Design a protein around this motif. Structure first.
Motif, PDB file in Angstrom:
ATOM      1  N   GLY A   1      -0.919   3.606  -5.294  1.00  0.00           N
ATOM      2  CA  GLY A   1      -1.930   2.577  -5.399  1.00  0.00           C
ATOM      3  C   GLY A   1      -1.750   1.358  -4.522  1.00  0.00           C
ATOM      4  O   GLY A   1      -1.051   1.387  -3.520  1.00  0.00           O
ATOM      5  N   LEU A   2      -2.431   0.286  -4.903  1.00  0.00           N
ATOM      6  CA  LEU A   2      -2.273  -1.007  -4.279  1.00  0.00           C
ATOM      7  C   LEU A   2      -1.428  -1.874  -5.191  1.00  0.00           C
ATOM      8  O   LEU A   2      -1.519  -1.775  -6.414  1.00  0.00           O
TER       9      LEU A   2
ATOM     10  N   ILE B   1      -9.306   2.425  -9.233  1.00  0.00           N
ATOM     11  CA  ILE B   1      -9.954   1.605  -8.220  1.00  0.00           C
ATOM     12  C   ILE B   1     -11.337   2.175  -7.894  1.00  0.00           C
ATOM     13  O   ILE B   1     -11.479   3.368  -7.648  1.00  0.00           O
TER      14      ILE B   1
ATOM     15  N   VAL C   1       0.859  -1.185   0.000  1.00  0.00           N
ATOM     16  CA  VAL C   1       0.000   0.000   0.000  1.00  0.00           C
ATOM     17  C   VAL C   1       0.894   1.234   0.000  1.00  0.00           C
ATOM     18  O   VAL C   1       1.644   1.451   0.958  1.00  0.00           O
TER      19      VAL C   1
ATOM     20  N   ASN D   1      -4.113   7.197   1.919  1.00  0.00           N
ATOM     21  CA  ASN D   1      -3.335   7.361   0.702  1.00  0.00           C
ATOM     22  C   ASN D   1      -4.256   7.739  -0.448  1.00  0.00           C
ATOM     23  O   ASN D   1      -3.948   8.631  -1.233  1.00  0.00           O
ATOM     24  N   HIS D   2      -5.413   7.090  -0.517  1.00  0.00           N
ATOM     25  CA  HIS D   2      -6.381   7.427  -1.551  1.00  0.00           C
ATOM     26  C   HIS D   2      -6.817   8.881  -1.480  1.00  0.00           C
ATOM     27  O   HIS D   2      -6.910   9.545  -2.508  1.00  0.00           O
ATOM     28  N   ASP D   3      -7.079   9.370  -0.275  1.00  0.00           N
ATOM     29  CA  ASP D   3      -7.502  10.758  -0.089  1.00  0.00           C
ATOM     30  C   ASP D   3      -6.480  11.779  -0.583  1.00  0.00           C
ATOM     31  O   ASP D   3      -6.839  12.728  -1.265  1.00  0.00           O
TER      32      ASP D   3
ATOM     33  N   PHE E   1      -4.058  11.226  -2.634  1.00  0.00           N
ATOM     34  CA  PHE E   1      -3.864  11.037  -4.073  1.00  0.00           C
ATOM     35  C   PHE E   1      -4.862  11.874  -4.861  1.00  0.00           C
ATOM     36  O   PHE E   1      -4.505  12.546  -5.827  1.00  0.00           O
TER      37      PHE E   1
ATOM     38  N   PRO F   1      -3.558   1.355  -9.589  1.00  0.00           N
ATOM     39  CA  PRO F   1      -3.515   2.784  -9.218  1.00  0.00           C
ATOM     40  C   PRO F   1      -4.792   3.274  -8.532  1.00  0.00           C
ATOM     41  O   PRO F   1      -5.881   2.783  -8.859  1.00  0.00           O
ATOM     42  N   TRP F   2      -4.660   4.241  -7.622  1.00  0.00           N
ATOM     43  CA  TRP F   2      -5.786   4.714  -6.807  1.00  0.00           C
ATOM     44  C   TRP F   2      -6.934   5.267  -7.666  1.00  0.00           C
ATOM     45  O   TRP F   2      -8.086   5.304  -7.209  1.00  0.00           O
ATOM     46  N   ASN F   3      -6.628   5.761  -8.865  1.00  0.00           N
ATOM     47  CA  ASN F   3      -7.685   6.307  -9.722  1.00  0.00           C
ATOM     48  C   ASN F   3      -8.369   5.239 -10.567  1.00  0.00           C
ATOM     49  O   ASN F   3      -9.419   5.477 -11.151  1.00  0.00           O
TER      50      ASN F   3
ATOM     51  N   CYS G   1      -5.069   2.529   3.162  1.00  0.00           N
ATOM     52  CA  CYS G   1      -5.730   2.615   1.865  1.00  0.00           C
ATOM     53  C   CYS G   1      -6.524   3.928   1.821  1.00  0.00           C
ATOM     54  O   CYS G   1      -6.401   4.694   0.862  1.00  0.00           O
TER      55      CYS G   1
END
Lengths: 292, 21
Positions: free
Chosen positions: A221-222, A242, A217, A284-286, A288, A238-240, A281
């Motif tokens: 992304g993952l 997902i 993580v 990191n997503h936030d 990103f 990648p986070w986008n 998750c």
């Protein structure tokens, strides 16, 4: 009354008197203000319960956390998230400095792999930051003799004596004349941030077929790794790209935005660890998205 | 910067160390 806490940073120690009702935010906002640290979203207060890290929750009372309550109740101030680009996102001097120290230790402790040649170049910036510009009349031969500049891994790869290392690092050190402390530490960070294991949180998992794997993580992304190769993922999300990550019992499912792309499910047994994975998750997503 | 770039420096460093193993 109050209860004392000790706060550990990479180079200092602090002690605070907290009212019994203090939430994580009270303690965390106070630590950051004391440091003059403005990029607070990268950092957190860490403690470790039975060989798993946990982070202080902001909206939760400090004493409702399962941290050992024996005074002083101790927390470690550390970066929890990493920027995609250090030169641009780390503005305050203390921020750059604490990242520098957290990342340098990861490298010297061999938690973050780096090739031999990268370790030599990184060392030279590290010594430049600590000793300032080079001056052969002051820094005489042998002045780095007991300074720890390289991972034990790289010195066990070469037929080279410590004086040969120190001679080699000093030459590269001399190449950085004119570079201020912060400038050398930022240069160190620019090199370190391109390393494959930089900024990634690893968790051991199993796919549905029962095969043991690693979950990575990080800020981008993952990632799914074969356990013997933490450098290069087999699969990346990648986070986008997902749509969602759902969690139930001991089962995660990664759902791609691209509905034709199969879903990826995996198991993790320890529930404390699964809570951590989700925070990482979520956080990191936030960051990103907010950067975009 | 006399070594030019980090991309160059890393290679200079790797090749000058390569004779040891």
């Amino acid at each position: 009354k109050t209860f004392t806490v000790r706060i550990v940073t990479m180079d200092a120690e602090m002690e605070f008197n907290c009212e019994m009702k203090w939430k994580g935010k009270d303690l965390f906002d106070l630590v950051c203000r004391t440091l003059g640290l403005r990029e607070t979203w990268f950092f957190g207060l860490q403690y470790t319960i039975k060989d798993t890290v946990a982070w202080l929750k902001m909206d939760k009372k400090v004493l409702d956390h399962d941290v050992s309550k024996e005074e002083p109740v101790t927390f470690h101030f550390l970066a929890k998230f990493y920027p995609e680009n250090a030169e641009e996102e780390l503005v305050q001097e203390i921020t750059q400095h604490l990242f520098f120290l957290q990342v340098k230790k990861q490298i010297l402790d061999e938690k973050v792999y780096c090739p031999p040649e990268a370790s030599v170049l990184l060392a030279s910036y590290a010594v430049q930051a600590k000793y300032g510009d080079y001056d052969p009349s002051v820094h005489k031969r042998g002045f780095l003799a007991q300074e720890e500049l390289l991972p034990k891994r790289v010195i066990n790869l070469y037929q080279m004596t410590p004086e040969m290392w120190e001679e080699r690092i000093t030459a590269w050190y001399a190449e950085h004349r004119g570079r201020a402390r912060d400038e050398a530490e930022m240069e160190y960070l620019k090199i370190a941030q391109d390393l494959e294991m930089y900024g990634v949180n690893y968790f051991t998992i199993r796919n549905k077929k029962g095969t043991e794997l690693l979950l990575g993580v990080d800020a981008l992304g993952l990632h799914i790794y074969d356990p013997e190769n933490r450098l290069t993922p087999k699969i990346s999300f990648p986070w986008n790209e997902i749509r969602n990550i759902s969690y139930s019992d001991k089962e995660f499912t990664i759902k791609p935005l691209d509905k034709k792309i199969d879903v990826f499910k995996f198991n993790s047994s320890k529930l404390r660890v699964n809570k951590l994975i989700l925070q990482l998750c979520i956080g990191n997503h936030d960051l990103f998205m907010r950067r975009r | 910067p006399k070594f030019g770039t980090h991309h160059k420096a890393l290679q200079e460093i790797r090749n000058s160390l390569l004779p040891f193993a």
